[PDB]
Amino acid sequence: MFEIKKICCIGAGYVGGPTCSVIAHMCPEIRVTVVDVNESRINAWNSPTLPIYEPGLKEVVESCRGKNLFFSTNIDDAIKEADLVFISVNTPTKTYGMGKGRAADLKYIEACARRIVQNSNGYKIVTEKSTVPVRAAESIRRIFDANTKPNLNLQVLSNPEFLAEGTAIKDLKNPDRVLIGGDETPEGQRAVQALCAVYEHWVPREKILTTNTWSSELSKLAANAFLAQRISSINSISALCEATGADVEEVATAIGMDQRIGNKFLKASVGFGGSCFQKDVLNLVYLCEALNLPEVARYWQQVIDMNDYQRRRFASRIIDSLFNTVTDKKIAILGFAFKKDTGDTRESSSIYISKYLMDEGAHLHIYDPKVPREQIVVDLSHDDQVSRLVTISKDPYEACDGAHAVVICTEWDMFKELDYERIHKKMLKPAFIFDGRRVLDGLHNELQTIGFQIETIGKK
Amino acid sequence: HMFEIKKICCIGAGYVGGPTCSVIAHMCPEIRVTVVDVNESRINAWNSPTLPIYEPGLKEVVESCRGKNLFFSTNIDDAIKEADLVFISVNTPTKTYGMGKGRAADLKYIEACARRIVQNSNGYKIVTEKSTVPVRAAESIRRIFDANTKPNLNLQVLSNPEFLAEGTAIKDLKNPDRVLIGGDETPEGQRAVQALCAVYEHWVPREKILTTNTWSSELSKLAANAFLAQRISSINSISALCEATGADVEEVATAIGMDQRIGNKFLKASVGFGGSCFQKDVLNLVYLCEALNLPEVARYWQQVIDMNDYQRRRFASRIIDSLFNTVTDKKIAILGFAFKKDTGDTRESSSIYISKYLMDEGAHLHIYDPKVPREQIVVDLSDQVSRLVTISKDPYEACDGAHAVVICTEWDMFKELDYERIHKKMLKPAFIFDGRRVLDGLHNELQTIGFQIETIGKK
Amino acid sequence: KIAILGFAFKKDTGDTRESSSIYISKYLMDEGAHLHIYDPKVPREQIVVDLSHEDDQVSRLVTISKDPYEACDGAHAVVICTEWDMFKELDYERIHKKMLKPAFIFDGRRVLDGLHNELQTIGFQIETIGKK
Ligand SMILES: O=c1ccn([C@@H]2O[C@H](COP(=O)(O)OP(=O)(O)O[C@H]3OC[C@@H](O)[C@H](O)[C@H]3O)[C@@H](O)[C@H]2O)c(=O)[nH]1
Ligand SMILES: O=c1ccn([C@@H]2O[C@H](COP(=O)(O)OP(=O)(O)O[C@H]3OC[C@@H](O)[C@H](O)[C@H]3O)[C@@H](O)[C@H]2O)c(=O)[nH]1
Ligand SMILES: O=c1ccn([C@@H]2O[C@H](COP(=O)(O)OP(=O)(O)O[C@H]3OC[C@@H](O)[C@H](O)[C@H]3O)[C@@H](O)[C@H]2O)c(=O)[nH]1
Ligand SMILES: O=c1ccn([C@@H]2O[C@H](COP(=O)(O)OP(=O)(O)O[C@H]3OC[C@@H](O)[C@H](O)[C@H]3O)[C@@H](O)[C@H]2O)c(=O)[nH]1
């Protein structure tokens, strides 16, 4: 019955931007307007240099922008004319009060809901889309139910986003599934069906799951936690491998060939990062404690404790290899993004490894091909310690020049292609490589012949 | 220089040794396979029309080979003496006293097999440990062999963990996802590994055979089992969250499992996992990690067992609460005692733990299972058994006059029972506690009939 | 089977009060070991009392040997807990022949120092306090 012809998305971030760009790309007859309070971000979306790095994103944006894809700071008018309003904003962790450091702060979701009511008349579908929805649909409904107008009829859906950064475009174009939650009422099902009709322009119907809003959000919270758990599980095995002379990459191969386990997300690492996994597990633990499910809470907390231990163990292996004094020693940090093919650093293990070494007085020279220099400075600041200890290098050979150790924290493909003979000539000896990503496997013989001490996760 | 296996001896005619060697003999008609055991009644059963374990398709495999190239015997000594390859597939029970009591595996039968092999061997032989939970097994065998040499005796030790699941053993053995063989990284070890590979290549493609050293083989099995158990505990933890918030764990599991990085297998919430593999495996992994001064890894994997124990306790207390916290002299039917469907095996079955929680409340249990022998149920539950436990010959007898029906094992026959007939003769309110989600889709009919239906992961 | 050589709390006495041999024996009894205990001066009955809580665990697990070769016959391990001088003069080639293999000597007193090369050549695994 109802056809979505105009879409407004509040939030032009890693979720809203790529998601709306793909919708516009696949649905040429739908006008898609992405809005944001951040004017410089909107200006960048409208420029030759997009505000985030995603493979393939520039091509998608440029094929649609100004045709049926628009980026604007005019939030009010985009809402007023929209058939469907996405809310894709950030929900930062509370920094004080109950749940400090653990529970999500819904203040931006609620501010979006109030702004939608202020600027809406008639019928609209309002859809919360995030990687970590924490009571998001309920809080929007809470606002809408309390702020009615004659003839205003807002429907609330949940539509979690499953994309992973660095593969956003491919993930959005061929999702494993689309998940839409709405009320089990006639109006709720009419709204769900309208959103299904958008996705059916490019997603087969059998890959679209529909449920209620709570089941949708819980499914996302749980699915994220299962993924994070696979990593902590293989990372726990990596510590066991180091202690017993086995190789975690070989053990992972044997594990993953069980088709009931599957062979994905078994790559041991210095530790998982990103704005999703830690926040998701912390909020799951907090929700469980609030529901008086302490056994479930402490079950999932281990996913975070293991990740924290993995990072700490890696840093202390570095410090031990430098014989427990790192004062005034130059150390190259190769990779600051939380994974390859993004400039995003949120919860990157590189931040934590860098801070552990700064606490030892190391002089870090940090190189990453896509993370902006100013972002690294902010991430490592509480300021004076950053001023004394942190240098941001424009190329990796400068970062390694005169270094005692090279620490690979992000699996950028270019790192396996470096001229390690040149790097060794200008390092102080003994020269260490700490591969926190297993990207140098198979170069171990060459690197040892050159003269490096190579240490990697899950192998001793 | 190589070695061709023409005669195989398997010490241990259990759920691992019997089916595995039967499939080997079936797939390798030119290899003589002799399964041996200290247990004479078990050997007699393997040689009879009624096998000592229930595995779908096993009788047909055994009867196609037995007496041609497959033999079952109590003559352990002669089987070893003539063997090219000796499998050790015995049980390693958990220690009941001393260091690691209740947690660490007891290697005494492995060590006795190793000593018996030296005694009865001359010349060259390959000795392969094959179990679902190998815990320092290859190392303990090597230690015995290194210390007990003879002129011209040359024993090689391999690890070859068994990945089969009971109830699907024959299909699993005929089409394994992978075969894992560990051997020494020496010329002798590689010759032994290749010999065992050649056996499996009669029916397993070479790209599915992984070769490594013995410790990496055992650690890979210990970890793989724990990953499987962890999936179950993870979805069971979500089932409690679903019950508390109005969601349905089966729908949540479907949404989770459609992520191809997670996969859609082993996401079936339940009263809790059982079997001789998973709990033993995680306990031994935790104990090993503690011994290696890895307490963070130990407490990480311990949560898999703690969650399973909580899932069982929570299910039992729902039953007791639904019966308003007094079950003294109340008849309760237990449908399913095996640890999963299509086996008669009860080792660590959740049905044991649920039954004991109800017995501690004074319930009169009537237990029905289509394949578990009556005497095993009596042993598993052991005066309190005499007072409280009845073994029913059919499920209608167990439910006659019952307050509650508790489904603990997902036997397919339970979804086809005459539940209108069951309701007529139960006391009211009549409860069904579906600990396996086997009655999904009958919920409307059962409510119309008049049952109170409670199931895991839904409220 | 495990041989316990030495039960007195030090050499040249029959006194067992708070002897380490009691505690080591009890740790091994908790593991189900069959202890065969030899000491040249401690009375048989004192060992029985020291290892009891008429004790059924003592009945099942403890044998008091009249000489050290009987204690070691068929043993997996020889545990020296008291530094009696006679222990370094034993015929360890004869002991090794009748032990099960691998045959361990756990020297809790360092009394076999300097015999280590001879004992390893014979074929023992020798473990001692304060050394690998
Ligand atoms: O009220 C607001 C709040 C926020 N915003 C904008 O919303 C955008 C959010 O983009 P971000 O890059 O910060 O966040 P993401 O797109 O990656 O969201 C993701 O990470 C943050 C998590 O809390 C979310 O669960 C996840 O979906 C920002 O550009 C911000 O300026 C608004 O326009 N209005
Ligand atoms: O095997 C692995 C996989 C991933 N990782 C690490 O885990 C972290 C997360 O990586 P992902 O590929 O999942 O990327 P993202 O965090 O952007 O996406 C994740 O959260 C958002 C959800 O919508 C996605 O479905 C989920 O994949 C990264 O730090 C990555 O390097 C490993 O260390 N090992
Ligand atoms: O010294 C021995 C010990 C045991 N055995 C026999 O070995 C056989 C083992 O069979 P079981 O049915 O008990 O055990 P499984 O075949 O199922 O082994 C499986 O579960 C037990 C666990 O300890 C193992 O890790 C697992 O592989 C028994 O029939 C037993 O009589 C011997 O012949 N000699
Ligand atoms: O989704 C699931 C799957 C399994 N289970 C339960 O988990 C327990 C184990 O079931 P399995 O099918 O794995 O059966 P098994 O214990 O025989 O095999 C397991 O251990 C031995 C290994 O070699 C096998 O690879 C492994 O699957 C059973 O109690 C089963 O009912 C669930 O509760 N949910």
Side-chain angles (χ1 to χ4, degrees):
Chain A
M1 255 296 293
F2 182 74
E3 185 181 347
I4 292 163
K5 290 311 298 294
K6 291 177 173 49
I7 296 178
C8 170
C9 180
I10 306 174
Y14 284 85
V15 170
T19 298
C20 285
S21 297
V22 168
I23 292 171
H25 188 64
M26 303 300 195
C27 311
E29 308 313 312
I30 299 181
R31 280 178 59 106
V32 182
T33 304
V34 195
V35 300
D36 206 294
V37 290
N38 185 338
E39 181 175 4
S40 62
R41 181 163 267 197
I42 291 301
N43 290 342
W45 282 110
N46 283 323
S47 84
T49 304
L50 300 185
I52 67 179
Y53 177 72
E54 272 293 341
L57 177 64
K58 179 179 169 69
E59 292 68 31
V60 172
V61 168
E62 284 174 357
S63 76
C64 299
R65 191 181 58 207
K67 191 166 59 160
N68 70 325
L69 176 67
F70 305 92
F71 300 90
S72 174
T73 55
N74 189 347
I75 298 165
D76 288 349
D77 283 333
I79 291 168
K80 180 182 181 299
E81 64 161 10
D83 298 309
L84 165 74
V85 182
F86 280 115
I87 300 174
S88 300
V89 301
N90 50 309
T91 53
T93 316
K94 294 181 67 184
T95 59
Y96 45 68
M98 282 170 44
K100 170 187 180 183
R102 307 181 301 145
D105 190 336
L106 284 167
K107 63 180 171 185
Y108 295 144
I109 300 274
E110 177 182 349
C112 288
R114 292 183 189 278
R115 188 152 192 182
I116 290 169
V117 173
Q118 171 74 215
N119 292 103
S120 293
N121 284 284
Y123 178 86
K124 299 185 189 299
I125 303 170
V126 179
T127 299
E128 201 274 336
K129 167 171 286 294
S130 59
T131 61
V132 188
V134 182
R135 310 185 76 195
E138 179 190 358
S139 75
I140 297 160
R141 274 193 308 270
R142 181 174 163 272
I143 298 298
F144 290 177
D145 289 345
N147 293 277
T148 63
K149 299 170 188 181
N151 301 314
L152 177 67
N153 184 14
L154 301 168
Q155 307 311 131
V156 175
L157 304 183
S158 170
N159 180 213
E161 189 42 62
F162 291 102
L163 71 83
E165 293 181 14
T167 56
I169 298 304
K170 293 281 241 315
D171 293 344
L172 286 160
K173 290 188 169 179
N174 188 20
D176 285 344
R177 73 289 206 212
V178 172
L179 178 59
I180 300 166
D183 294 352
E184 312 188 345
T185 64
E187 288 267 48
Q189 290 306 289
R190 275 195 288 281
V192 167
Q193 170 57 216
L195 184 54
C196 286
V198 175
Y199 284 107
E200 285 176 13
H201 287 77
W202 79 100
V203 178
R205 182 49 178 98
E206 68 267 17
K207 292 172 108 183
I208 303 171
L209 296 176
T210 62
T211 184
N212 54 73
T213 59
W214 168 244
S215 185
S216 169
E217 295 184 347
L218 175 57
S219 295
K220 187 56 154 80
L221 292 179
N224 293 332
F226 272 69
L227 290 161
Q229 179 173 253
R230 288 178 74 86
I231 302 165
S232 283
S233 288
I234 199 64
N235 279 341
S236 78
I237 302 305
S238 81
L240 190 50
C241 286
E242 293 165 21
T244 62
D247 182 347
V248 76
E249 281 289 292
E250 302 183 341
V251 175
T253 298
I255 293 168
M257 285 190 86
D258 191 333
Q259 295 186 57
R260 304 166 300 173
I261 303 175
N263 64 19
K264 307 299 186 304
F265 265 52
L266 300 174
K267 282 282 155 284
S269 68
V270 57
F272 63 76
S275 63
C276 180
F277 283 172
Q278 176 173 287
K279 176 188 300 90
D280 186 274
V281 178
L282 287 174
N283 273 281
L284 180 60
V285 168
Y286 184 84
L287 171 67
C288 287
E289 293 174 1
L291 292 163
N292 191 24
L293 299 167
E295 294 88 356
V296 179
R298 70 176 64 98
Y299 181 84
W300 287 105
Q301 179 66 37
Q302 278 304 312
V303 170
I304 293 315
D305 292 357
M306 175 56 50
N307 199 58
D308 292 341
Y309 162 71
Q310 183 76 346
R311 293 164 162 177
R312 286 196 311 270
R313 190 178 86 265
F314 189 64
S316 52
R317 280 183 72 193
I318 297 170
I319 295 159
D320 292 343
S321 294
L322 303 178
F323 243 81
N324 204 35
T325 181
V326 200
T327 298
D328 297 335
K329 287 183 180 162
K330 177 168 178 182
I331 297 184
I333 306 298
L334 299 189
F336 210 77
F338 82 98
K339 55 177 292 188
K340 76 170 183 181
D341 294 346
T342 181
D344 190 357
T345 69
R346 286 175 295 173
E347 295 306 332
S348 172
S349 291
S350 307
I351 300 168
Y352 294 84
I353 301 306
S354 294
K355 282 187 174 184
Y356 288 137
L357 298 171
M358 290 164 66
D359 289 340
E360 299 287 341
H363 291 180
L364 304 182
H365 292 235
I366 306 179
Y367 172 80
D368 189 283
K370 289 295 180 177
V371 174
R373 184 195 56 86
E374 301 85 351
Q375 186 64 51
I376 302 173
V377 172
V378 165
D379 287 336
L380 294 182
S381 301
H382 287 79
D383 184 66
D384 173 68
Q385 192 185 36
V386 175
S387 187
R388 293 185 289 102
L389 305 184
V390 172
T391 307
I392 295 167
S393 308
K394 286 307 145 198
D395 79 84
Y397 298 102
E398 170 182 294
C400 300
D401 187 6
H404 293 254
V406 182
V407 187
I408 302 179
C409 296
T410 313
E411 74 288 0
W412 290 103
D413 295 309
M414 61 168 292
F415 293 154
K416 50 187 67 76
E417 310 296 330
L418 297 176
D419 187 348
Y420 283 98
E421 188 170 344
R422 162 185 177 185
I423 289 170
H424 181 80
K425 291 185 179 171
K426 285 197 173 181
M427 283 184 72
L428 288 172
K429 318 299 194 299
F432 290 84
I433 299 175
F434 295 90
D435 183 357
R437 290 294 190 163
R438 304 298 301 240
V439 284
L440 304 185
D441 291 13
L443 293 189
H444 276 218
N445 287 332
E446 291 94 332
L447 294 172
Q448 282 179 348
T449 301
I450 293 174
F452 287 100
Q453 197 84 249
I454 306 120
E455 306 280 86
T456 194
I457 288 185
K459 190 174 181 72
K460 193 73 86 25
Chain B
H1 296 292
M2 105 277 320
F3 185 74
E4 185 182 347
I5 293 163
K6 296 301 302 217
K7 292 172 279 173
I8 296 178
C9 167
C10 180
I11 307 172
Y15 285 87
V16 171
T20 301
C21 295
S22 297
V23 168
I24 292 171
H26 183 64
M27 300 299 193
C28 311
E30 93 283 6
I31 301 182
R32 182 185 183 96
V33 183
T34 305
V35 191
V36 298
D37 204 293
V38 291
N39 183 336
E40 179 215 2
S41 63
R42 181 162 266 198
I43 292 301
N44 292 343
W46 282 110
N47 284 321
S48 84
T50 304
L51 298 183
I53 66 179
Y54 177 74
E55 273 292 342
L58 174 62
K59 177 179 169 69
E60 291 65 29
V61 171
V62 168
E63 285 177 358
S64 75
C65 296
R66 190 181 56 206
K68 306 179 208 312
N69 69 324
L70 174 65
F71 301 87
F72 298 89
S73 176
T74 53
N75 191 346
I76 297 165
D77 289 348
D78 272 327
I80 292 170
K81 180 183 182 299
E82 287 166 347
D84 298 314
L85 165 75
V86 181
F87 282 114
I88 298 175
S89 298
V90 301
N91 49 310
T92 52
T94 313
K95 292 181 66 184
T96 60
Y97 44 67
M99 281 169 44
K101 171 186 181 183
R103 309 167 52 203
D106 192 336
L107 284 289
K108 62 181 170 186
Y109 298 134
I110 299 275
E111 178 181 348
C113 288
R115 290 183 189 279
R116 185 151 195 179
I117 290 169
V118 174
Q119 201 154 5
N120 289 280
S121 293
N122 285 286
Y124 178 101
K125 300 186 190 300
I126 302 171
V127 178
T128 301
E129 200 274 336
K130 167 172 287 293
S131 60
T132 60
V133 186
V135 180
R136 311 184 76 196
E139 179 190 358
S140 77
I141 297 165
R142 273 194 310 273
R143 267 182 29 118
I144 298 298
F145 291 173
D146 288 344
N148 292 275
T149 63
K150 301 171 187 182
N152 299 314
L153 175 66
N154 185 12
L155 302 168
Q156 289 298 311
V157 177
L158 302 183
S159 172
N160 182 211
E162 188 40 60
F163 288 104
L164 73 83
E166 292 180 14
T168 57
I170 298 305
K171 282 188 182 295
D172 293 345
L173 286 162
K174 290 185 170 179
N175 186 19
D177 284 343
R178 73 290 204 212
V179 170
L180 179 59
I181 300 167
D184 292 350
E185 312 187 344
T186 62
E188 288 265 47
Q190 291 306 290
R191 168 178 61 175
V193 168
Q194 191 279 159
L196 186 54
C197 289
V199 176
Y200 284 104
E201 285 174 14
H202 287 75
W203 80 101
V204 179
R206 188 45 176 90
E207 66 268 19
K208 293 172 108 183
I209 303 170
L210 296 177
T211 62
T212 182
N213 54 75
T214 59
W215 168 244
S216 185
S217 168
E218 296 184 346
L219 174 59
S220 295
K221 187 57 154 81
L222 291 177
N225 295 333
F227 271 70
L228 290 161
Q230 179 175 67
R231 289 177 74 88
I232 301 164
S233 282
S234 286
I235 200 65
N236 279 340
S237 79
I238 301 304
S239 82
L241 190 50
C242 286
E243 290 163 20
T245 62
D248 181 348
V249 75
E250 282 287 291
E251 303 182 340
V252 174
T254 297
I256 294 169
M258 282 189 87
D259 191 335
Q260 296 186 58
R261 303 165 299 172
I262 301 175
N264 62 18
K265 305 300 187 304
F266 264 54
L267 302 174
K268 290 173 166 64
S270 67
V271 56
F273 63 76
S276 61
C277 182
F278 284 169
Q279 176 174 288
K280 177 186 300 194
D281 185 275
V282 177
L283 285 174
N284 272 280
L285 179 59
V286 168
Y287 183 83
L288 171 69
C289 295
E290 290 176 1
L292 292 163
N293 193 23
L294 298 169
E296 295 86 354
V297 178
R299 68 176 63 98
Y300 182 84
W301 287 106
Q302 181 64 36
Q303 278 303 312
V304 173
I305 292 173
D306 290 357
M307 177 56 52
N308 199 232
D309 293 341
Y310 163 73
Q311 183 78 347
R312 291 163 163 177
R313 285 195 311 269
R314 191 177 87 265
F315 189 64
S317 54
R318 282 182 73 193
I319 297 169
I320 294 158
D321 291 341
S322 294
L323 303 176
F324 248 73
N325 204 35
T326 180
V327 331
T328 296
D329 296 335
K330 289 184 179 164
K331 178 167 183 183
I332 297 183
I334 303 297
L335 299 190
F337 209 78
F339 81 97
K340 59 177 293 188
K341 76 170 183 180
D342 293 347
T343 181
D345 192 357
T346 69
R347 287 173 294 175
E348 294 304 330
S349 173
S350 290
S351 308
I352 300 172
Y353 293 83
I354 301 303
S355 294
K356 284 185 175 184
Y357 290 134
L358 297 172
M359 290 163 65
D360 290 341
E361 298 288 341
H364 290 182
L365 303 184
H366 291 236
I367 304 177
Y368 170 81
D369 188 283
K371 291 297 181 178
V372 173
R374 162 197 161 88
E375 299 78 7
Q376 188 65 49
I377 302 174
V378 173
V379 165
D380 289 337
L381 294 183
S382 301
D383 173 69
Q384 193 185 36
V385 178
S386 302
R387 293 185 289 101
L388 305 183
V389 173
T390 307
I391 303 314
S392 306
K393 305 187 178 304
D394 75 85
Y396 299 104
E397 169 185 347
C399 298
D400 187 6
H403 293 255
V405 180
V406 185
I407 302 179
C408 296
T409 313
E410 74 287 0
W411 292 103
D412 294 309
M413 60 168 291
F414 293 153
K415 68 189 63 217
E416 308 172 353
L417 296 176
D418 186 349
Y419 284 99
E420 190 170 346
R421 163 186 177 184
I422 287 169
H423 181 80
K424 291 185 179 171
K425 290 267 207 302
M426 282 184 71
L427 285 302
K428 320 299 193 298
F431 290 86
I432 300 175
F433 293 92
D434 183 357
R436 291 294 193 162
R437 304 296 300 239
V438 284
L439 302 185
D440 287 11
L442 294 189
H443 274 217
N444 288 333
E445 292 110 291
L446 295 169
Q447 284 177 348
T448 304
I449 292 173
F451 288 102
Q452 202 84 2
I453 310 156
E454 308 282 6
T455 198
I456 289 184
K458 190 170 64 183
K459 188 52 167 184
Chain C
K1 178 167 178 181
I2 296 183
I4 303 296
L5 298 190
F7 209 79
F9 83 97
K10 58 177 292 189
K11 74 170 184 181
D12 294 347
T13 181
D15 192 357
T16 70
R17 285 174 294 174
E18 296 304 330
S19 171
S20 291
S21 307
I22 298 170
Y23 293 83
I24 300 305
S25 295
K26 283 187 173 184
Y27 290 139
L28 298 171
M29 289 164 66
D30 291 342
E31 299 288 341
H34 290 180
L35 303 184
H36 291 237
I37 306 177
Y38 170 81
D39 188 283
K41 290 298 180 178
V42 173
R44 171 193 173 84
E45 167 74 0
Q46 186 64 49
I47 300 173
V48 172
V49 165
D50 289 339
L51 293 183
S52 301
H53 291 66
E54 186 153 305
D55 202 283
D56 176 69
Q57 193 185 37
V58 175
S59 303
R60 294 183 288 102
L61 303 185
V62 174
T63 307
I64 296 166
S65 307
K66 295 297 117 178
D67 78 72
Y69 300 99
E70 169 186 347
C72 299
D73 186 6
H76 293 252
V78 181
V79 183
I80 304 179
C81 296
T82 313
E83 75 287 0
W84 291 101
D85 294 307
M86 61 168 291
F87 292 157
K88 44 181 150 287
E89 309 169 353
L90 295 175
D91 187 349
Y92 283 100
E93 192 171 346
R94 164 186 177 187
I95 287 170
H96 178 79
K97 293 180 180 167
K98 285 210 191 297
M99 281 184 71
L100 290 172
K101 318 299 194 299
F104 290 86
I105 300 175
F106 293 92
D107 183 357
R109 290 294 191 163
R110 305 297 300 238
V111 292
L112 302 186
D113 288 12
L115 293 188
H116 274 217
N117 287 332
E118 178 197 328
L119 294 173
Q120 283 179 349
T121 302
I122 289 174
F124 289 103
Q125 301 274 320
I126 307 93
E127 308 283 6
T128 195
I129 289 185
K131 191 172 181 168
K132 212 114 92 148

